[PDB]
Amino acid sequence: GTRKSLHGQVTNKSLAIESGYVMNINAKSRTFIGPGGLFDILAQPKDTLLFTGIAFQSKKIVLTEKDCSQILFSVSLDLVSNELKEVLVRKDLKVKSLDSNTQKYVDMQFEDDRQSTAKNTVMYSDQTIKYGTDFVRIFKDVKKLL
Amino acid sequence: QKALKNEDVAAKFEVATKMYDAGKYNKAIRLFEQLAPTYRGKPQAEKLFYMFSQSYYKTKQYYLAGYQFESFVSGYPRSEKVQEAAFLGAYSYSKLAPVYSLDQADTVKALDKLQAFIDNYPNSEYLAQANESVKILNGKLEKKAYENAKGYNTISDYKSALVAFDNFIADFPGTPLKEDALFYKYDSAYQLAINSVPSKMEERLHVAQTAYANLMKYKSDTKYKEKADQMNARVETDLQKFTK
Amino acid sequence: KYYFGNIKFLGNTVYSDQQLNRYLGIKKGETYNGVLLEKRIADNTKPDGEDITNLYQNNGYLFSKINAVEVKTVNDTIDFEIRITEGPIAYFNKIYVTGNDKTNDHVIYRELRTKPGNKYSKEELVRTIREIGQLGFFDPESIKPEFRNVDPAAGTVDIEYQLVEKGSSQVELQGGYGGGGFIGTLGLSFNNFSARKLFDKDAYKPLPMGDGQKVALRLQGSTYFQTYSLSFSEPWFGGKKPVQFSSSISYSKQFNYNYSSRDVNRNQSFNIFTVQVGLAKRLTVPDDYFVLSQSVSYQHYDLNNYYTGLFTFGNGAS
C-alpha cells in the first residue's frame, strides 16, 4: 500500500521492444519505454498500468503486492502482427563505463579516509617534498609526446 | 662451440646428441635452438625435438619445456612417444602455478591441459599423477577464494565478509575448508549484530542464529564449539531485549 | 537565434521535477546552447562533475541514462523533454582482481573501496582506481574495472580489476622552492618490501617482495643542508587496521645560513644523526576523524666551528 517507484522491463520474444508509453490510470501519470524496455513509474498495489505502443498490442495489467516487491517487474508485451522472426536473442542492457586511459583518475586528489593508512605528523622529515615538481613524471610525459 | 659456429648441421646434431647423453643439457640446448628451425620436419626431427624438450624439462625451464613438448605432439602426430610428451607438457605447465595469493592465470591453463590430457588419453600410465596434480591445482583456486573472503573479516568489514563467504560456500561445494568458512560466517554476523544500529539489530541477531545452526548441523563436534557456544550466549541474551 | 523554453523531465520517479530543475539550472528565455545542455546532463570531461547523470549513478542506479529530446520549435523557442531512465538499483556482488603476478591479493583487496554487498557508486569505483594507482606497482593507464555477470533482474554486478604490474622499485626526483631557496631530493624506493622474508635468501630478487611494506633510501639537499636517510614504513601494522609503523636513520650536515642575505659560511656547520620510530593509527573514539601519532627519536649533534648566535660551544656535541 505504498506509491513507491516501480521499475520494470518490457520484453518481446521476437523483436526488441523500445519506444511507447506506460500510464497508471489511477494516478493519471505517464512515462516512456527507454532503451532495453526499462520503465519507472510511481504506482501502488492494486493499480492498473496501461501499456501502449506502435510495435506492440495495448495491454492493461493490475499490479499486485508480489509485482510491486520485485526488483525488476518484467512485463511481456504482445507484438502486433505475427511475423515470428527468430527468438530475439537476449542482449544485456548497456552500462556506461569509465575511460580507457585511467591516468586522469589516478591523478585525482582525495583526502584520507577510514581505509587509508594514517599519516604520522609528530616525526621528522622523510626527505620528501609534498606536491613538489616530479621530474620522473615529466620525463614520462615527454616520452609519450614522442 | 666449434659445432655451433660451423654450418654442418650433421656435426652439430651429433655433438648435441653427445651433450644430451652426459647430462650437458645446458650446452646442448644452445646448439639445439639454432638447429631446431632448419632440422624441422625432417625424418630425424622426432629425436631432435624430443631431447630438446627433455633438456628444457631437466633444466627446470618448465615454460620452455611445456611449449616444446606441446609442439612436439602437434607437429609429429603419431610419434612412438606422443603420450609421454602430452603428459609432460601439461605437467610442466602445472609446475609454473603460482601461490594462491598471486594471480592464478597459469593454474587455469594447467588445468585445461591436464584435464584434456585425461580425456584424450584415458587408461594411461600417468593417470595417477595427473589426478594428484589436478587436486593440488584445484586446491589453490579454493584457497584463493577462501583467503579473499576471510581477508574481509581480518580488516573487519563484516558486511562484505558475509556476502563473500556466502558465495564461497556455494561456488566451491564439498570442500575441506567449509567448516572454517561456516564459523567465520557466524563470527562476521556476530560482530555485525553486537555492534550495529539499534534499528536493525534484530535482523542481524537472527542471521547470527541461522549461521550458528548451519555450523553445528555441518559438524556437530566442530573444533570451534567452545567459542561458538559462547557467541550464541550473547545473541540469545541480547535477543531478550527485543522480545516484544 | 533560438531561446530555451519549457524544460520538462520524464521518468524521474526518484527525484522530483523541482530538484532536477535546480540541478540543471536552465531558465526560460535563455539563448539555446547545445553544449551547455549536454554538459549539465552528463559532463563526460570530468568524473566528479555536478550533473544529473552523476546524481543517479552515485546512488546505485548503474543503468541510468539521460537523453534530451527536442519536442517543439515554435517562434524561435525550443522545448526539451529530458528523459531519464532510472533503472533498478544494483549492488556489488563479487569483487576480484586479476593481473597481480608479483603482488599478493591481500595488499590489493585491502585498498578497494567497492565492498561487496554495497550499492553501486561511481565515486567508489573512481576512488578505488586512484588508491590502486597510489601503490605504484601497476600501470597508471591500465587500471580498468570491468563489469562482469551484470544481472539487471537480480540487481547485482561483479567488478573485475585488471591490473598490469610494472615493477615495485621506483626512482624519486623531486624539487621545490621554499624559504627563498631551491630544494631537491633524490632517492630510490622499494614499495613492495617484505620484512618477513628478510632472512630468507632464496627469494632475494631486487630485495624480498610480498607485503606492501616500503623501504626508501633518499637524499635531500639545499643551499645550507644535505641529508641522507634510510626509511622503512609499514602501511598496515598488525594486519587488521591501517596502522602505520615507520622507522628512519639519517645523517645531515647543516651549514650556517643567513636567511636575510641568503649567504652560507661553509666553514661553520654541524652534523645531526637521528634515529626515529613512529606509530600512527586512526582512532575509532570519540569519532573516526581522529588520528593519534606517536614518535620516539634519538639525535646526536656534532658541532664543527659553529660559533653563531647562542652557540658558544662550537666544538661540542649534544
Beta bridge partners of C291: C282
Beta carbons of C97 and C164 less than 8 angstroms apart? no
Q: Does A133 touch chain C (CB under 8 A)?
A: yes
Angle formed by the axes of helices B127-154 and B178-194, nearest 10°:
10
DSSP summary character for residue B75: H
Name the nearest CA neighbour of C282 among A115, A116, A118, A110.
A118
Q: Report the run of H or E that residue B9 belongs to, with start and end.
A: helix B9-21
- Which contiguous run of DSSP H or E holds residue C252? strand C244-258
Distances (CA, A) of C130 to A110, C275, C302: 8, 33, 44
Q: Which amino acid is at B236?
A: E
How close C246 comes to chain B (CA, Å)? 20
| B188, containing H or E segment | helix B178-194
SS3 at position C92: strand
Decide: C279 and C243 in contact? Cβ < 8 Å: yes
Chain C residues closer than 8 Å to A116 by CB: 131, 242
Contact B107, B140 (CB under 8 A): yes
> Cα separations (Å) of C34 from B197, C69, C70, C223?
47, 11, 11, 56
Distance from C-alpha of A1 to C-alpha of C252, rounded to nearest angstrom: 75
Report how far residue B219's alpha carbon sits from residue B215's, in angstroms, rounded to the nearest whole number.
7
Residues of C in contact with B163 (CB under 8 A): 93, 116-117
Grid cell for residue B146? 577462501
**Residue among A36, A35, A38, A47 nearest A2 (CA):** A47
B108 at C interface, C-beta within 8 A: no
Residue C317 to residues A125, C24, C112, C308, C314, Cα–Cα distance (Å): 22, 68, 49, 15, 9
CB B51 within 8 A of CB B17: yes
Closest CA in chain C for residue B96: C101
Beta-strand (E) ranges in chain A? 5-11, 21-24, 29-32, 38-42, 48-52, 59-62, 73-76, 133-134
Decide: C135 and C212 in contact? Cβ < 8 Å. Answer: yes
Are C112 and C161 spatial neighbours (Cβ–Cβ below 8 Å)? yes
Query: Which H or E run includes C192?
Result: strand C181-193
CA dist., res. A4 & res. A44, Å (int): 7
Across B210-236, b (16+ Cβ under 10 Å) vs e yields ebbeebbeeeeebebeeebeebbeebe
The position carrying cell 610428451 is B85
Contact residues for B55 (Cβ-Cβ < 8 A; gap 6+)? B20, B25, B28, B29, B32
Which residue among A100, A118, A126 sits closest to C291, beta carbon to beta carbon? A118
Rounded CA separation C26/C105 (Å): 48
- Cβ–Cβ under 8 Å, residues B85 and B73: yes
Strand order in the sheet with A29-32: A29-32, A21-24, A48-52, A59-62
- Distance CA(B108)–CA(B111), nearest Å, equals 5
DSSP class of residue C165 equals B
Report how far residue C233's alpha carbon sits from residue C135's, in angstroms, rounded to the nearest whole number.
Answer: 13
CA dist list (Å): B14 to B19, B28, C155: 9, 10, 67
Edge-to-edge strand list for the sheet holding C244-258: A133-134, C169-178, C181-193, C213-221, C225-234, C244-258, C263-283, C290-304
- Site of grid cell 623531486: C174
Supply C107's cell numbers: 595488499
Q: Cβ–Cβ of A106/C130 closer than 8 Å?
A: yes
Q: How far apart are CA C225 and CA A40, in angstroms?
A: 67
**Cα-to-chain-centroid distance, residue C152:** 31
Instruction: Look up residue B212 and give its amino acid.
Output: Y
DSSP A139: H
Q: How was this structure determined?
A: cryo-EM
**Closest partner CB to B163 (pick from C100, C101, C116):** C116
Closest Cα partner for B55 from B104, B105, B92? B92
Q: Which cell is C132 given?
A: 590502486
CA atoms within 13 A on the CB side of C259: 4
* Whole-number Cα distances in Å, C13 to A19, B24, C63, C87: 18, 77, 14, 10
The verdict on whether omega for the bond into residue C47 sits within 30 degrees of 0, i.e. cis, is no
Entry resolution in angstroms? Answer: 2.7
All residues at 6 or more sequence positions from C32 whose CB lies less than 8 Å from its CB, including other chains: C1, C2, C3, C4, C78
Within 8 A by CB and 6+ apart from B166, the residues are B185
Q: What is the spatial distance between Cα C231 and Cα C242, in angstroms, rounded to a whole number?
A: 18
Q: Is B98 on the interface with C (CB under 8 A)?
A: yes
Q: Looking at the complex, does the CB of residue C236 fall below 8 Å from at least one CB of chain A? A: yes
Nearest by CB to residue A102, choosing from C57, C144, C220, is C144
In angstroms, rounded to a whole number, what is the distance separating the alpha carbons of residues C288 and C281?
Answer: 11
Distances (CA, A) of B141 to B63, B111, B149, C314: 21, 11, 13, 67
Which of C123, C44, C164, C51 is closest to A108 using CA atoms? C123
Q: Residue C153 in contact with residue C129, Cβ under 8 Å? A: no
Q: How many CA atoms lie within 13 A of C265 on its CB side?
A: 12
Burial of residue B189 (number of CB atoms within 10 Å: 0-12, 13-18, 19+): buried
Please give the Cα distance from C212 to B106 (Å, whole number).
Answer: 24
Q: Return the bridge partners of B171, or none.
A: none
Measure the CA–CA gap between C172 and C242, rounded to whole angstroms: 25
